[PDB]
């Protein structure tokens, strides 16, 4: 029983890139401790949205909100540390997905 997701779908499943964070620490941090965050993202449809970045955005937002609930509460617990990784993550995630999804829906449907 979700409380916030106008039926967000789940992506099939991606890869973990690195995340040159730019810090010596939030690199090694993370190529360490990566096994905890999901390899995957929620969005809505591209196509309800008209542009990239409201949607990557409520992407971030709704990937996060989806785990704050479920994952957390009475399971695991992002840090305010793990909570920017995930940002990082995430926006870089979506906008992957989006490579799929916008293109996709796109090179032989969209026209603008």
């Known amino acids: 029983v979700v409380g916030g997701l106008g ?21 090694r941090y993370y190529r360490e401790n990566m096994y905890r965050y999901p390899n995957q993202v929620y969005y809505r449809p591209v196509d309800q949205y008209n542009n990239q970045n409201t949607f990557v955005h409520d992407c971030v937002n709704i990937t996060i909100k989806q785990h704050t609930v479920t994952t957390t509460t ?9 909570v920017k990784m995930m940002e990082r993550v995430v926006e870089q995630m979506c906008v992957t997905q989006y490579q799929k999804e916008s293109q996709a829906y796109y090179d032989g449907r969209r026209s603008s």
Do not use: C, Q, V
């Open 74 to 82: 009475k399971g695991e617990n992002f840090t305010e540390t793990d």
């Open 7 to 27: 039926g967000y779908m789940l992506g099939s499943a991606m890869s973990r890139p690195m995340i040159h964070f730019g810090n010596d620490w939030e690199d």
